[PDB]
Structure formats: C-alpha cells, structure tokens
Design an enzyme around this catalytic site. Structure first.
Site, PDB file in Angstrom:
ATOM      1  N   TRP A 166       0.842  -1.187   0.000  1.00 42.91           N
ATOM      2  CA  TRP A 166       0.000   0.000   0.000  1.00 42.91           C
ATOM      3  C   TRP A 166       0.865   1.220   0.000  1.00 42.91           C
ATOM      4  O   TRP A 166       2.013   1.145   0.381  1.00 42.91           O
ATOM      5  CB  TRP A 166      -0.906   0.048   1.222  1.00 42.91           C
ATOM      6  CG  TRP A 166      -0.181   0.108   2.534  1.00 42.91           C
ATOM      7  CD1 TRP A 166       0.170  -0.949   3.335  1.00 42.91           C
ATOM      8  CD2 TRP A 166       0.243   1.291   3.244  1.00 42.91           C
ATOM      9  NE1 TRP A 166       0.784  -0.499   4.484  1.00 42.91           N
ATOM     10  CE2 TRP A 166       0.842   0.868   4.453  1.00 42.91           C
ATOM     11  CE3 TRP A 166       0.168   2.677   2.982  1.00 42.91           C
ATOM     12  CZ2 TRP A 166       1.370   1.764   5.379  1.00 42.91           C
ATOM     13  CZ3 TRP A 166       0.703   3.571   3.915  1.00 42.91           C
ATOM     14  CH2 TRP A 166       1.295   3.107   5.095  1.00 42.91           C
ATOM     15  N   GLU A 200       9.161  -1.429  18.375  1.00 45.04           N
ATOM     16  CA  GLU A 200       8.126  -1.639  17.363  1.00 45.04           C
ATOM     17  C   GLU A 200       6.832  -2.160  17.979  1.00 45.04           C
ATOM     18  O   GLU A 200       5.748  -1.756  17.575  1.00 45.04           O
ATOM     19  CB  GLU A 200       8.610  -2.554  16.222  1.00 45.04           C
ATOM     20  CG  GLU A 200       9.775  -2.008  15.384  1.00 45.04           C
ATOM     21  CD  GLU A 200       9.338  -1.197  14.164  1.00 45.04           C
ATOM     22  OE1 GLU A 200       9.061   0.028  14.296  1.00 45.04           O
ATOM     23  OE2 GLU A 200       9.288  -1.760  13.065  1.00 45.04           O
ATOM     24  N   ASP A 208       1.875  -2.950   9.539  1.00 46.93           N
ATOM     25  CA  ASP A 208       3.293  -2.776   9.213  1.00 46.93           C
ATOM     26  C   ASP A 208       4.246  -2.942  10.398  1.00 46.93           C
ATOM     27  O   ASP A 208       5.297  -3.559  10.279  1.00 46.93           O
ATOM     28  CB  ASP A 208       3.531  -1.387   8.641  1.00 46.93           C
ATOM     29  CG  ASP A 208       3.377  -1.341   7.150  1.00 46.93           C
ATOM     30  OD1 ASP A 208       2.594  -2.163   6.585  1.00 46.93           O
ATOM     31  OD2 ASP A 208       3.988  -0.501   6.454  1.00 46.93           O
ATOM     32  N   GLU A 209       3.904  -2.349  11.534  1.00 47.63           N
ATOM     33  CA  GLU A 209       4.803  -2.401  12.669  1.00 47.63           C
ATOM     34  C   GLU A 209       4.825  -3.841  13.214  1.00 47.63           C
ATOM     35  O   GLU A 209       5.869  -4.324  13.638  1.00 47.63           O
ATOM     36  CB  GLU A 209       4.453  -1.333  13.731  1.00 47.63           C
ATOM     37  CG  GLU A 209       4.735   0.146  13.359  1.00 47.63           C
ATOM     38  CD  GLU A 209       6.218   0.464  13.098  1.00 47.63           C
ATOM     39  OE1 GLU A 209       6.768  -0.150  12.139  1.00 47.63           O
ATOM     40  OE2 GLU A 209       6.846   1.324  13.818  1.00 47.63           O
ATOM     41  N   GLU A 258       8.939   2.267   6.235  1.00 49.78           N
ATOM     42  CA  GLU A 258       8.590   3.116   7.366  1.00 49.78           C
ATOM     43  C   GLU A 258       8.302   4.514   6.924  1.00 49.78           C
ATOM     44  O   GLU A 258       7.497   5.212   7.529  1.00 49.78           O
ATOM     45  CB  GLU A 258       9.691   3.100   8.418  1.00 49.78           C
ATOM     46  CG  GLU A 258       9.624   1.858   9.292  1.00 49.78           C
ATOM     47  CD  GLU A 258       8.706   2.028  10.484  1.00 49.78           C
ATOM     48  OE1 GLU A 258       7.958   3.022  10.538  1.00 49.78           O
ATOM     49  OE2 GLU A 258       8.754   1.180  11.388  1.00 49.78           O
ATOM     50  N   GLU A 288       7.178   9.215  14.086  1.00 49.25           N
ATOM     51  CA  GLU A 288       7.283   8.589  12.789  1.00 49.25           C
ATOM     52  C   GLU A 288       8.168   9.379  11.877  1.00 49.25           C
ATOM     53  O   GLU A 288       9.033   8.809  11.217  1.00 49.25           O
ATOM     54  CB  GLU A 288       5.916   8.455  12.143  1.00 49.25           C
ATOM     55  CG  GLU A 288       4.986   7.533  12.898  1.00 49.25           C
ATOM     56  CD  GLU A 288       5.226   6.085  12.582  1.00 49.25           C
ATOM     57  OE1 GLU A 288       5.978   5.766  11.641  1.00 49.25           O
ATOM     58  OE2 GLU A 288       4.641   5.252  13.285  1.00 49.25           O
ATOM     59  N   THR A 322       4.783   0.746  19.466  1.00 49.00           N
ATOM     60  CA  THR A 322       4.011   1.488  18.489  1.00 49.00           C
ATOM     61  C   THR A 322       2.890   0.668  17.792  1.00 49.00           C
ATOM     62  O   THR A 322       1.922   1.252  17.285  1.00 49.00           O
ATOM     63  CB  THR A 322       4.935   2.243  17.500  1.00 49.00           C
ATOM     64  OG1 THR A 322       4.687   1.799  16.166  1.00 49.00           O
ATOM     65  CG2 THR A 322       6.399   1.891  17.718  1.00 49.00           C
ATOM     66  N   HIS A 355       4.652   5.871   6.658  1.00 42.51           N
ATOM     67  CA  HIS A 355       3.879   6.208   7.851  1.00 42.51           C
ATOM     68  C   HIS A 355       3.831   7.725   8.106  1.00 42.51           C
ATOM     69  O   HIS A 355       2.770   8.297   8.315  1.00 42.51           O
ATOM     70  CB  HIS A 355       4.445   5.505   9.074  1.00 42.51           C
ATOM     71  CG  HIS A 355       4.529   4.021   8.944  1.00 42.51           C
ATOM     72  ND1 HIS A 355       5.269   3.245   9.804  1.00 42.51           N
ATOM     73  CD2 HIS A 355       3.959   3.166   8.062  1.00 42.51           C
ATOM     74  CE1 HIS A 355       5.157   1.974   9.457  1.00 42.51           C
ATOM     75  NE2 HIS A 355       4.367   1.898   8.401  1.00 42.51           N
ATOM     76  N   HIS A 385       7.247  -5.926  11.176  1.00 40.05           N
ATOM     77  CA  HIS A 385       8.610  -5.591  11.574  1.00 40.05           C
ATOM     78  C   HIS A 385       9.002  -6.153  12.935  1.00 40.05           C
ATOM     79  O   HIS A 385      10.120  -6.676  13.091  1.00 40.05           O
ATOM     80  CB  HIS A 385       8.806  -4.093  11.572  1.00 40.05           C
ATOM     81  CG  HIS A 385       8.582  -3.454  10.238  1.00 40.05           C
ATOM     82  ND1 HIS A 385       8.319  -2.105  10.099  1.00 40.05           N
ATOM     83  CD2 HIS A 385       8.593  -3.969   8.986  1.00 40.05           C
ATOM     84  CE1 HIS A 385       8.174  -1.820   8.817  1.00 40.05           C
ATOM     85  NE2 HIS A 385       8.333  -2.934   8.121  1.00 40.05           N
TER      86      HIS A 385
HETATM   87 FE   LIG Z   1       6.191   3.315  12.100  1.00 35.46          FE
END
Ligand SMILES: [Fe+2]
Ligand SMILES: [Fe+2]
Lengths: 346, 346
Positions: free
Chosen positions: B45, B179, B211-212, B126, B88, B182, B129, B215
């Site tokens: 995305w 990570e 996403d986080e 990243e 971010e 968040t 974000h 990771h």
């Molecule tokens: Fe982030």
C-alpha cells in the site's frame, strides 16, 4: 520487478586510518566555522509557510487557486519537479551516507560532536524540502501520487553508493558538488515556475534553493580546510571523484515500469534547461575556482597529475557533452507513470 | 531556545569485536529468514490509498468529508496522534541508529548484505507512515502544522541515543521492544478513531499497525537466533536494556514552548489508554515469553542474575506503575502548541 543495482565494485574505508585524528582535531574548528550556517530552528521557515492554511477560512480558495495555477504548468516541468522532489524524499539514505564517513560519523545517534551536530542539523533542515514539495505536488492534482510514492519506496530500498569509500575527503567533496547541482536545479525550476505564472511555486523552489546554497557554503568550507591542512590527500580525493564522475543520489530511481527512469528524467531536465551536462561542468570549474586548485604548489608526484587532471577536465567535459545533436532535436516522446503515463519529449 | 539533551554518558562499541563474525556468518540465515517479511514494493500500500484523490472529481467532497469527520475527534486524541506522527517523521534518525550497529551496518549506503538490504527496506516501508499521517493531519485542519513541523525539525536535530552502544544484540532488542510499543499505540489510536466515527482514520492507524507488527516479527526473529547462538551475551544484553529502561525515539521532543513536551504527550497518551505504563510491562513479558527466557539453562555466573532480573521485572514494574493516583484524577490541564495552545487533561 527488480530495480537497477549499483554496477561498481563496492570499496570501504579507503582513507588511511591515521587520518581520523585530523577530523577529531578539526572538531572545534568546525564548531566555529560550520555551526554558524545553522539558523536557529525558530528562525527557519517551515513548509506550512508556503501551503494553503488548513486552519483558515482561506483554505478552499487557496487550494483552488493552487490547482488553477498548476494547470498552466506543462507536464514536462512536472516530471522534472517530481524527480527533483523524489530525490529530496530519499533523504534518510543521504543522512545514512554522511554517517558512513569515518572521522565525522555520529557514533550513537545523538553524538555531541560538531560533525554529528552538523549532520543531524543539515538533515533536519533538509527534511522540510520533501514535505513541502510533496504536499505541493499532492494538492496540485497534476501528478500520480501513488506512482511517485512507489518510486520513493523503491528508491529508499535501493539506496545509493556515491563511491565515497567512507572518506570525509570524498564525502565532503561529493556533497559539495551535489548540493550545488540541486541549487542550480531548483534555481531553474523556480525561474520557470514564475515564467509559467505560478509565483507561489517559484517561491517554493527559490526557498529550497536558498537552503541548498547555505549548505553548499558549509561543505566547501570543510573541504577548503582539508585542502589547507592536507593538500596532497585532498587533490587526490578531488581527482578520484571526478574520474568516477559524480553520480546523483537518485540514480537508482525506479517506478516498476521504466528500467531507465533516471536517464529519462534527466533528459527532460536537460531539454528544459533545469540541469544540463553544461551545468555539471560549471560546478567543478566553480569548485576548482573556489578551492584555488590552480594556485596550489609543492605536492607529491601523484598530486601533480591529480591537480592538472582536475584543472583541465571542464573544457573537455564541455566539448564532449555539448554535442546535443542526436538528442537536442529528434528525442523521442515517452510516457511517465508519475504523470499517469502522459508523455513528454526527451 | 535550547531543546532537551541526552542526560547519560555516551558509550560506544561495547560488544566484543570478535563477535562481528557471528553476524557476518548469520548473513545467509538472515536472507532466508528476514527477507521474507519483505512484501515486494508492488504489493505494498501507499499513502495515496488512504487519502483524497487529488486527480479525481471526488477530491473536494473527500477533503470535505475528511474534515467534517475530524471535528468529531477530540483534541486530546489529536495530541496523541500528532506525537505519534512526529515520532514517525523522525525516521532519518532511526535508520541512522540501525546503521550505528556494528556487524549489521550498511558500510556504503547500498551494501549488498542481508542486514543492509533489510535496513534499507524497513526504512522504505517506514517512510510511508510519516507521509500518510502528515498529510492526513494537514488536511484535517484540526492541528497547527507549523508548530508540528517546527517540532520535527527540533527532533531530527536532537536525534536520540537509545543507549544501544553499537551492539546489534542491544539494537535488535531495542527495536524489538520499540516496534511492539508502536503496534499497541496505533492499535489503540485505530480503535479510538473508529469509536469517534472516523473509519477512514481508523484504517490509516490500523494499516500502520499491521506494518509495525510485521517488523516486530522480524527483529524478534533476529534476537531469537542470537539467544540460540549466544545465550550468555544475549540475556546479558536484554537485562542491560531493561535496567536502562527503553527510551522512546521521540523523547527529546521540543516545540520551542514546552520543556517537558514528551512527558506531557505521554501523559495524554496514558490517560486515553493509547500507550500506558501497563503496556510497557506487557511488552517485555511478551518478550520474555517469546524468547523463552525462563526456559533457558546452562549459563555463566552473570547470566543467572540477568535472566532472573528480566523474568521478575514485569510484576514489579506492574505494581510500581499501576498507582495512577496523583495523575489518574487531579491531572492539570495544559496547552499544546500542536493544537494552537488549546488545552487538554494530562
Ligand atoms: Fe512506524
Ligand atoms: Fe534539498
């Protein structure tokens, strides 16, 4: 869907380690000669200064005027502007690059050293360029933001190896050449935005240009002192970089569609007169001028040739790259995903 | 107008150098265990997916609906969201941080190593974000973008020293903890955006959360292997980090007006249940659970105490930090430049 890769053998740590001390010695010098080109944050402009004010009753008419104006700006311009903007947004890479440099690296992320303070500050200043151009571009509606975003993700993933080999000599020369390239770049996107009736965009480019000029002054001053302290190693460094040709931070640019995206973007930039092969020359001549390279004497066997090569390079590069014949007439037209695969001359 | 500084002695390169080899050895392991949590760029995305479409006839009504909805979201939420967003945008710092790490650093900017490929890729992921949250916030008109921008510039200039001492052991444990913090943060800003009727914003936070989490899985997997290869050094590293307390990447946050801006932002975040002292515990318990720290045996004299400290820390941290008494009732109300000095409970 693989992006282009760096094509050259990767060399690390090519500066004699015994020379880190010179940069540790130069620390206080840098604190009093570099940390002055730092406008305090409170004094700095911020992107919001140049954009519609989302907390104002003005917002609508401002966004509307912004877009109305962007219509009178041609697609070719935007391609260049977009490329410019993408380069800018690849900043993390560039900070990372500066931090590869051996005697001037931030060892922790918050090192109290002058070199580090400068790096973190330059980066903080640079960060506003992406933001500004981005939002401008978003608001404009003239460009494909998803394809631009995609391009950026590819770019950061790819990175760059500017071939500085962990040498502050090379690193600071690179950035010296680099920043001047983008001062000219933006200098012209600015001039041209005015020419197409968009003063507010010209202002955006012009301000970004001012910022890059201030940084230019700073990195050249680092190199000036290096030339002063260690003429030999420095001339050697300057010749090395020129031999390799300076490669722009965005050369591994890729959008999932065009395998020569950089070449193509650069071509448009050249046709419009934003950044030409002619400029690339003007830069190192200015740099050979600025660093009084011709005025140096007493060097090592190797220094002699390095100086002469670097002094005599611009006229040759001038002739070599002023035969815009095959390309300054019968350049093909080519689509760009950044503008919805609309097309522009190359 | 000076921002807050790091208050602890700065230690560099605290991992035995003879241990770089383990990460050079682990290279191919990483290529087949980490470079899978890499969604190809084409599949990723992009921010545009979640924002009004500036090249659509829909743009206006979309921007209009976006802002109409942002009115039903309270200022306190926004403070938290904005702080979240600023953290971010300090990304350049964080990449730089990962690249301080000794056996896993990108030596050139485009190193072909698995460690580097991961770093450059993680960073490219990243980057989206900040962009997303930024533009969202810009369009919303509920926040003071100039003060936010100013905050960011201070932040990047200040950086962070997460006290990882150039150790991939410490670095990867830090980011593991980080990570997850968040993921929870955004998990809740997401939940809460829905609760205030803004599904589109909930989607923005939820995607960023996804996403986080991806990771998180990756960095824990690096640490899992470290625990596996070198139990001793690793437990030692984990206990070291916990003793120090994990410090958030945005702690030196400053807006030119509030000398305790981080503390204050965190307080709102805690009041709203976005990220609490309670969560901070839940993280390392999950981490002590995940890394089967309790299940380890045969260690060195020093390993024993390190394991036990790390296993028994969460209950203590739990009691110690569940006496929200002075602050979970009579918290003062306080202005925030991020929202035009409007005020919220702390
Ligand atoms: Fe982030
Ligand atoms: Fe720039």
């Amino acid at each position: 869907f693989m992006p282009p890769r760096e094509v050259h053998v990767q060399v690390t740590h090519s500066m004699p380690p015994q020379k880190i001390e010179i940069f540790k010695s130069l620390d206080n010098w840098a604190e009093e000669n570099i940390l002055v080109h730092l406008k305090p944050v409170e004094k700095c402009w911020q992107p919001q200064d140049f954009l519609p004010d989302p907390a104002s009753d003005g917002f609508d008419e401002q966004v509307r005027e912004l877009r109305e104006r962007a219509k009178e700006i041609p697609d070719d311009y935007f391609v260049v502007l977009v490329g410019d903007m993408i380069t800018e947004e690849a900043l993390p890479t560039y900070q990372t690059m500066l931090n590869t440099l051996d005697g001037v690296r931030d060892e922790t992320g918050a090192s109290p050293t002058s070199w580090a303070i400068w790096t973190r500050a330059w980066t903080a200043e640079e960060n506003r360029h992406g933001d500004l151009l981005n939002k401008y571009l978003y608001l404009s509606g003239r460009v494909d933001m998803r394809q631009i975003e995609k391009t950026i993700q590819y770019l950061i993933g790819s990175g760059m190896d500017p071939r500085t080999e962990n040498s502050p000599y090379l690193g600071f020369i690179y950035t010296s050449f680099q920043e001047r390239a983008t001062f000219i770049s933006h200098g012209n996107t600015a001039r041209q935005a005015k020419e197409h009736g968009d003063i507010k965009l010209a202002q955006i480019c012009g301000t970004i240009a001012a910022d890059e000029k201030r940084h230019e002054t700073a990195y050249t001053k680092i190199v000036e002192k290096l030339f002063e302290i260690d003429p030999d190693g420095t001339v050697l460094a300057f010749a090395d970089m020129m031999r390799k040709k300076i490669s722009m931070p965005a050369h591994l640019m890729y959008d999932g569609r065009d395998d020569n995206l950089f070449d193509h973007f650069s071509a448009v930039a050249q046709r419009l007169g934003v950044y030409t092969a002619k400029d690339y020359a003007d830069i190192l001549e200015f740099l050979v001028g600025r660093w009084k390279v011709d005025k140096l004497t007493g060097l090592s066997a190797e220094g002699q040739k390095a100086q002469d090569y670097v002094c005599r390079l611009p006229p040759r590069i001038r002739r070599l790259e002023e035969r815009a014949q095959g390309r300054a007439k019968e350049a093909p037209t080519m689509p760009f995903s950044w503008i919805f695969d609309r097309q522009v001359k190359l």
